[PDB]
């Protein structure tokens, strides 16, 4: 009840996005902070098909179920998680630009 509600609506769940550059004008992008329950294969395979990209479903020690993409995308990696209960609009880090 209320307890869980709070413990969830005000704690944990913090959603990282980042952008970097491979070279010249080539770029890369990641996402982290998404819950284990969700199938990563289904989100990654969406992003891809909606624009020439390239995903992954990488699992890294103590940071795992972290997925990256090819190209600079920051805007749409925020936009798509806003309407979709994936980011309480409060946990949205951008490290781009």
């Amino acid at each position: 009840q209320q307890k869980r509600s709070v413990q969830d609506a005000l704690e944990a769940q913090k959603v990282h996005i980042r952008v970097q550059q491979r070279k010249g004008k080539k770029f890369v992008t990641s996402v982290q902070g998404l819950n284990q329950a969700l199938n990563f294969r289904r989100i990654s395979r969406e992003f891809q098909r909606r624009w020439g990209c390239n995903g992954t479903v990488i699992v890294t020690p103590d940071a795992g179920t972290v997925i990256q993409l090819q190209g600079n995308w920051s805007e749409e990696i925020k936009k798509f998680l806003l309407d979709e209960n994936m980011a309480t609009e409060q946990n949205l880090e951008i490290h781009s630009l």
Partner: protein, 225 residues
């Protein structure tokens, strides 16, 4: 003016007629009623001492508090006759960072030292935040011109980075204004305002979650031999 009676057809017709002459009687009658009604409310005449002084609370509500606050707010001499004209919305002036493209890889930022001074934060700490976001190396040292391995087409668009730093760390969310000064309170607790002294805490970056991989290899393994 206006009578009240047990009206009947004939008497109804009187009222009808009286109105038809001029509509002033009814109009101005109910202009006069709210005048003395509202006087009686605000200055109070209500029964029982606690509600009488309740409408006396109301009486001293009427600008009286705000009046004493006029002379007060003028007497501080820091809400009045200053650089608030523009410093209000933060319209403050910040040195416009200025760049160089050396080697078509690196970007040297000459104005680094001057900039860091202006919002009154030290050297190494400011540098950290910048370099973390962009996820590059480079250092400072030198003649206090920064170096970065990040490559961009030469622009004024470095500003976005600075904006993030300034709206997290230095800029209070009370007034919008930087005169601010960092403190050490408890563990991971810092920051103070001093132009109205509404204290605010903030926390400092220590990233280390995910960075990906980029991007040559062979060399990496070779060095990590």
């Amino acid at each position: 003016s206006n009578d009240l009676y047990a009206l009947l057809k004939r008497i109804t017709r009187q009222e009808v007629e009286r109105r038809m002459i001029e509509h002033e009687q009814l109009r101005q009658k109910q202009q006069r009623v709210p005048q003395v009604e509202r006087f009686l409310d605000a200055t109070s005449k209500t029964g029982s001492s606690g509600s009488s002084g309740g409408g006396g609370n109301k009486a001293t509500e009427e600008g009286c508090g705000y009046n004493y606050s006029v002379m007060l707010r003028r007497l501080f001499f820091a809400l009045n006759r200053n650089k608030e004209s523009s410093a209000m919305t933060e319209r403050n002036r910040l040195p416009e960072p200025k760049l160089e493209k050396i080697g078509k890889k690196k970007v040297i930022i000459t104005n680094f030292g001057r900039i860091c001074q202006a919002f009154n934060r030290p050297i190494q700490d400011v540098k950290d935040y910048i370099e973390k976001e962009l996820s590059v190396g480079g250092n400072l040292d030198s003649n206090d011109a920064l170096i970065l391995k990040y490559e961009i087409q030469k622009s004024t668009a470095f500003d976005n980075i600075l904006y993030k730093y300034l709206d997290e760390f230095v800029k209070c969310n009370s007034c919008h204004k930087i005169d601010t000064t960092l403190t050490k309170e408890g563990r991971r607790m810092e920051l103070r305002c001093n132009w109205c002294t509404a204290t605010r805490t903030v926390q400092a970056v220590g990233s280390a979650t995910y960075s990906a991989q980029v991007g040559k290899r062979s060399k990496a393994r070779l060095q990590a031999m």
